[PDB]
């Protein structure tokens, strides 16, 4: 199937409570493989998956150095952005960055990403062309000007089309046992009477990997998108995910409803109904 590699970074200032806390994590699809926390006992790029443990200490030293340089750049940038937004130095602020690449089943680049947010709002983002920027406001246009002067986009494009795709390919091979295994959902429908004249049908999906899934309810073969309650896909803690979709139905019409399940571990979409 298709795969993704992403690095996530969060810096949170805490005036009066020391320097900003920095946490970064790396993922291949929905598997975390590295983490670095500035407030850990021994901050380092820590391998979190068996398949990455083979890279060796020199690799971890290099990755650790990159993490520490980014924590330092973020401390400088949190001060800069107080100036750009004319803010008090007293408040807590957050800087986030995500970057990475998506590849198709042939390992070819589908899309590259590099984007930043300040206080949870878009700040500056590399466009899909990997050559232009979307600056959210006039402060981010100052950064855009610096980055267009330093030819940042060109350097990013070369990483995203090169090392990003090559290393994701290497990790997918080294971790093929897990990264390249899709665990289909275990599915069932439960029934819960609401009143004398209505009941809830809840379609469950458990134990699936990756997280991407579609659960839909049809009434007489028509999608019930507007009337379906969908919970956010949630982690089980054993690598797998869970999700449910529910509909409120007139009592006695249960067999007119069908739950449809799409997941990459399924060879074909699955159809299920309330059985008893």
């Amino acid at each position: 199937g298709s795969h993704s590699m992403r690095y996530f970074h969060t810096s949170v200032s805490r005036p009066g409570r020391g320097e900003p806390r920095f946490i970064t994590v790396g993922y291949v699809d929905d598997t975390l493989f590295v983490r670095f926390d500035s407030d850990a006992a021994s901050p380092r790029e820590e391998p979190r998956a068996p398949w990455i443990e083979q890279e060796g200490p020199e690799h971890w030293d290099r990755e650790t150095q990159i993490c520490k340089a980014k924590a330092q750049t973020d401390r400088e940038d949190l001060r800069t952005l107080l100036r750009y937004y004319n803010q008090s130095e007293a408040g807590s602020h957050t800087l986030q960055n995500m970057y990475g690449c998506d590849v198709g089943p042939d390992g070819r680049l589908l899309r590259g990403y590099h984007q930043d947010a300040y206080d949870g709002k878009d700040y500056i983002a590399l466009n899909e062309d990997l050559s232009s920027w979307t600056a959210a406001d006039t402060a981010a246009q100052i950064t855009q000007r610096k980055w267009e002067a330093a030819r940042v986009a060109e350097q990013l494009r070369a990483y995203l089309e090169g090392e990003c795709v090559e290393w994701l390919r290497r990790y997918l091979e080294n971790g093929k046992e897990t990264l390249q295994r899709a665990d289909p959902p275990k599915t069932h429908v439960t029934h819960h009477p609401i009143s004398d004249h209505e009941a809830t049908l809840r379609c469950w999906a458990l134990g699936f990997y990756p997280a991407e899934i579609t659960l839909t309810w049809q009434r007489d073969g028509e999608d019930q998108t507007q009337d379906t309650e969908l919970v956010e896909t949630r982690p089980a803690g054993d690598r797998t995910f869970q999700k449910w979709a529910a509909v409120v139905v007139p009592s006695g019409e249960e067999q007119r409803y069908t739950c449809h399940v799409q997941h990459e571990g399924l060879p074909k979409p699955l159809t299920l109904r309330w059985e008893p």
Binding site: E45, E63, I66, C67, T80, Y84, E163, C164
Partner: peptide, 10 residues
């Protein structure tokens, strides 16, 4: 593998 850059200040 992380991306390494200099001059990335905002």
């Amino acid at each position: 593998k992380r991306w390494i850059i200099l001059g990335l200040n905002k």
